[PDB]
Design a binder for these strands. Structure first.
Lengths: 90, 72, 105, 246, 50, 73
RNA sequence: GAUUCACGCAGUGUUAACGUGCAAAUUACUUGUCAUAUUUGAGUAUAGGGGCGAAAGACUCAUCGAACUAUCUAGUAGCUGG
RNA sequence: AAGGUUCCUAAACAACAUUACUUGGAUUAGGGUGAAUCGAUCCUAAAUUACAGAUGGAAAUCCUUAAGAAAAGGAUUGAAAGGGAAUAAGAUUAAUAGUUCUUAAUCAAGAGAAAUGGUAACAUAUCAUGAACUUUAAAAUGGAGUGUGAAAAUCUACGGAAGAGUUCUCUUUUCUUCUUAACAAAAGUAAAUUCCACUGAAAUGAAUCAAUCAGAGAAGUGGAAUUUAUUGGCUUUGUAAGAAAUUCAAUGAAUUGUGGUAUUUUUGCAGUCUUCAUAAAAAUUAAAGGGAAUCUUUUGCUCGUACUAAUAACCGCAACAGGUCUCCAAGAAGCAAAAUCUUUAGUUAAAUAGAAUAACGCAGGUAAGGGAAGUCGGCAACAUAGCUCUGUAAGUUAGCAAGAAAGAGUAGCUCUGGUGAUCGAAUCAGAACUUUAAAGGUUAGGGGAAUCCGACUGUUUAAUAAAAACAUAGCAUUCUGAUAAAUCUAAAAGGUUCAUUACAGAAUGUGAUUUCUGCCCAGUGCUCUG
RNA sequence: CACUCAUUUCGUUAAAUGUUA
């Protein structure tokens, strides 16, 4: 249908090639489905900025602005898990 | 359009009648009277308004009680 | 066609100023006043609309019969059957687990 | 001359916060015995969008420690919190995401958020989207700990200052390019009146200190002292450096 | 307006009552100088401003 | 206005002392017995002339009866 | 915060009409715009070296490069008129 | 809202409405506004104001639950468009009527050891107890777009009853009426959604305009609930034909079926999309957990209610071509709520006319041959214009340019074929023949080639400047760890951003994208960990 | 330098602070 302007085709020709390309990556992630961490169904969809609701599974999860989990919050979860193990074991 | 045209939308009263002085000087949004200086306990009078003093003061009304006390 | 007028003195199409134009005797049409559409009861946990309770205005629930504003079950009218069924299993299974885990394991 | 827009902002008439649809004040619960010496459990009932702020808010329900009833709270949601989760607040709380612990119980290197500046003041630092503070070091001699603020500055706090373990949800909000003036207009729907900013050079000499003449230019240095009076303090104040840094 | 306060309506009625002329018998009094009421008004000529 | 359905309940209405007035309207097909009670106006649609006469006899003699036809009173 | 037409609104041109006017700013045609940075009512908030301003020294009751009103005040005038 | 008696009637016409008036929104005198159910009253919103306290030389300012021996928890006011107990039809008046009258209803406040059924979802004309306390739900929540249920209006099929129109030319014809409320009932019968029971789906199925869904269980079969403008959505029934409509006779008689896979409006519903926007509260109501204790009848207070709501009742000095918020809404034709014509309703008066038909005007037109030579300048006018088919360049941020440009067709009449359901929809294609050779009555883009500026949508000097000016997104700089930064105040347990916390707050410059931002710290600023 | 006792900034329903047991 379109060569390379896939989702930012709604913007027409009026915001600059680079700005349309930067927002294209974010809008694809913002409107995509994600695997539910509790029921493993590809059904998590954003409702508001930072709120992700799992449709066929009935869970409301706080996450990133445009993705279910940020890379910064992914390391923090692993950092806290490692720190808790050290505290629990000596 | 600042002349004839803009006067068409004048259908909201800034002032209504005052309970204490009887003049259409009660500002609705300010909740006070511009003439008698309502809820303020003292009646509003100014020395630069010498005519406004002789328009509403002692003796400009009925003097229902004071007309008898002084003559007595 | 026959054109109508408001009967009350509300001249604006607000939410409480809904009307229905119905035909009357002699071919003339009269103006009614229609009620607002109301929501129903929701489970306190899952937020789902409860069955067996009508979606009417809050003051109209008093006029209903006693059995028409609730369901003959525990937490009837405030919790769904799924909401209640998990409450029963949570209550029994946690207490049973505590009985063996602690309390003379 | 006239009064600049920065001066008119301090009277707060049309510049008051548009805080009508806000959920409430987001903070920890008031500190009591059961959280100084024990732990309380709170259920995350729902996660909501607080107007005017980028991070989601959690409606946590602690039962009650002393009376009969409920204690409905309103936390700033940490990333990874979900509905129906059990979170714990107290000194002996486990080191899990979403729990509220005294800052002295967190090991060095722990990532926390909604930290208290003064104990019992219900959270000050690390409250915006994706923001956090890191525990640097502890000091048991005077019962104090060091944390790293999101701006990079280090702060020394009492060891019993409370914070929530994890990242504030909603990170990456500012990485999406606003494209339209309309979107920026809607961004301040539940905020103050600031958005359409007229440049000072585009004004007249009465309106602004930058109000120029026949050519749109400032005319005098834009770096000013901190002691400049209001109405002339326009531009960069106490600027140590200036320009595209290298 | 149709909608009005009770005391405002009574002040409207008084302005109606005062918009009347001198009665004929009053004009035949000896030494009479009051023939026409000069405090008179009409709705389309002067607005009473209340 | 409420409607009684069969022949039994109407009789108990005239037998009861709550009655206030009775109006009988004869139509081209049926006859309606409208019992004016304190709160409601109960009506019975009798399509049988034989049972209509029985209902007419059961009316207590001390109550007002209005017979209506093609012309209203 | 795509293109257009209509209900509405504006005011690009005629530098048309009128210019002791319908009007102390309007009329006609042409043109533009005609729902999300939209249009609009009511309530409410902000007041004069102040307010408000997508910024024209614009608007703040036909009054604005500092409103209106009253007092100081019969302000002073080497200047004009009698 | 504003006006305030302008409303209705009678007498009367001096003045007023640029002539006149027997007319009038004008003069004189009378008459007129009826509520338990409509509103105000009640609740709170943005906000507003008290006692005590804090502050000030003073006037007074601040605070609104914090400071209090005040208020179980926090005071006043704030909406005739927000929330809200409950009334309809017909008739009636010179004028008021969800207000009077007739009939029929509804609401509130009064008076006369604690049940069953179903596996279940859940169900039983009050039934079938349920205190303190706590919890939940309701009141009570954006917008776009698609599909669809129902009603009404319009159109139309079948069968008529009654009246009217045309009729020397025809027309079994054209037109009009054929209706029914609140509140309740339960013959018959729907659409959508969500749950429950049985069983367990792969050869994966189910389905929508689109989607979407399923072993945390699909499809199938059988059930439960709720929504659909009052009871229960529609037909039907009570009210209720006794009303009303249309006729006929001189008060009395006649009628008042059934349908439609059509269009529009209204009202719900179901899922889809969109937000760095997530789109009120309280009065007040119901339910739950807990287990303390052991049909008739009466009353329903206060205030508003007349009239205009505008080319004459309002604001502009006025019966001013200006301005001023809404509700209802027929036919033709068309994509269209466009222009044009008509029906119901309103009106023919709205700063006077008659004769004549000079110049010069204002408004609307046309024109031989030429075709911008006129002019500062194609100003003004002309011109193009709907739909279908073919075709469409450079450039480009690859999205566009584009309705590019360019070309052909279009009428009337008589036919044929395609698109469905178990008779019907306007839509499309094709073929004969005829003509004045067909979008054009009305409506209805002129196009192309370059250059400059602003990136774009948007805003602006009300009344000589609408733009290249302002805004904008993008880029960049500065300060600030909150007892802070900025900043209002004479002061202040004072105020604003701040219900906030660096992805934040505050102060600035440039102005989308692409490419690039060179050298200079002497001077004036600013800064230093000196 | 050490303390708190005026003073500053706070938080709560002034709801287990400090020392023993």
């Amino acid at each position: 249908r379109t060569k390379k302007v896939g989702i930012v085709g709604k913007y027409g020709t009026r915001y600059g090639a680079s700005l349309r390309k930067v927002i294209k990556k974010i809008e694809i992630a913002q409107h995509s489905k994600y695997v539910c961490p509790f029921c493993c169904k590809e059904a998590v969809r954003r409702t508001a900025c930072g709120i992700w609701e799992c449709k066929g599974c009935g869970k409301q999860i706080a996450g990133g602005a445009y993705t279910l989990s940020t890379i910064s919050g992914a390391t923090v979860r692993s950092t806290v898990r490692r720190l808790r193990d050290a505290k629990n074991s000596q | 359009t600042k002349g004839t045209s803009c006067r068409g939308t004048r259908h909201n009263k800034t002032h209504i009648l005052c309970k204490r002085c009887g003049k259409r000087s009660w500002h609705l949004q300010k909740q006070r009277c511009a003439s008698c200086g309502y809820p303020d306990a003292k009646m509003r009078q100014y020395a630069w308004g010498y005519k406004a003093l002789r328009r509403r003061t002692q003796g400009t009304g009925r003097m229902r009680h004071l007309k008898i006390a002084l003559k007595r | 066609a026959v054109r109508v007028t408001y009967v009350r003195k509300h001249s604006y199409n607000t939410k409480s100023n809904g009307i229905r134009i119905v035909k009357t005797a002699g071919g003339n049409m009269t103006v009614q006043h229609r009620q607002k559409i109301s929501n129903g009861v929701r489970c306190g946990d899952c937020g789902c609309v409860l069955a067996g309770i009508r979606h009417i205005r809050p003051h109209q629930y008093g006029w209903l019969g006693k059995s028409k504003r609730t369901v003959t079950r525990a937490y009837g009218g405030v919790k769904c059957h799924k909401c209640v069924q998990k409450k029963i299993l949570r209550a029994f299974l946690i207490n049973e687990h505590n009985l063996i885990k602690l309390a003379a394991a | 001359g006239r009064r600049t827009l920065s001066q008119r902002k301090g009277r707060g008439s049309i510049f008051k916060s548009r805080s009508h649809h806000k959920l409430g004040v987001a903070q920890h619960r008031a500190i009591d015995f059961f959280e100084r010496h024990s732990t309380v459990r709170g259920l995350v009932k729902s996660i909501e969008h607080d107007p005017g702020r980028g991070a989601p808010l959690a409606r946590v329900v602690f039962r009650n420690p002393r009376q009969y009833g409920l204690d409905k709270e309103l936390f700033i949601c940490a990333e990874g919190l979900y509905s129906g989760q059990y979170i714990y607040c107290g000194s002996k709380a486990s080191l899990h995401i979403g729990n509220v612990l005294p800052i002295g119980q967190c090991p060095e290197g722990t990532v926390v958020c909604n930290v208290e500046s003064k104990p019992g003041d219900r959270g000050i630092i690390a409250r915006a989207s994706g923001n956090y503070a890191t525990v640097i070091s502890h000091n048991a001699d005077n019962e104090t700990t060091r944390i790293r603020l999101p701006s990079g500055a280090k702060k020394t706090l009492k060891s019993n200052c409370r914070a929530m373990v994890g990242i504030i949800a909603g990170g990456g909000r500012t990485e999406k390019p606003i494209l339209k003036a309309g979107v920026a207009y809607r961004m301040y729907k539940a905020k103050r009146t600031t958005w359409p900013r007229v440049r000072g050079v585009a004004m007249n000499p009465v309106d602004h200190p930058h109000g120029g003449g026949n050519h749109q230019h400032v005319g005098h240095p834009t770096t000013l002292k901190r002691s400049s009076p209001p109405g002339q303090k326009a531009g960069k104040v106490a600027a140590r450096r200036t320009g595209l840094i290298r | 307006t149709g909608h009005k306060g009770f005391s405002y309506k009574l002040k409207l009625g008084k302005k109606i009552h005062q918009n009347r002329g001198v009665p004929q018998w009053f004009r035949m009094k000896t030494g009479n100088t009051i023939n026409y009421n000069f405090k008179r008004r009409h709705w389309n000529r002067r607005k009473m401003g209340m | 206005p409420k409607q009684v359905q069969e022949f039994k309940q109407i009789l108990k209405l005239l037998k009861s002392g709550s009655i206030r007035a009775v109006r009988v309207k004869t139509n081209g097909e049926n006859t309606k017995f409208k019992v004016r009670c304190a709160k409601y106006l109960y009506t019975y649609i009798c399509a049988d002339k034989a049972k209509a006469e029985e209902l007419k006899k059961a009316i207590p003699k001390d109550i007002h009866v209005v017979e209506i036809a093609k012309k209203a009173p």
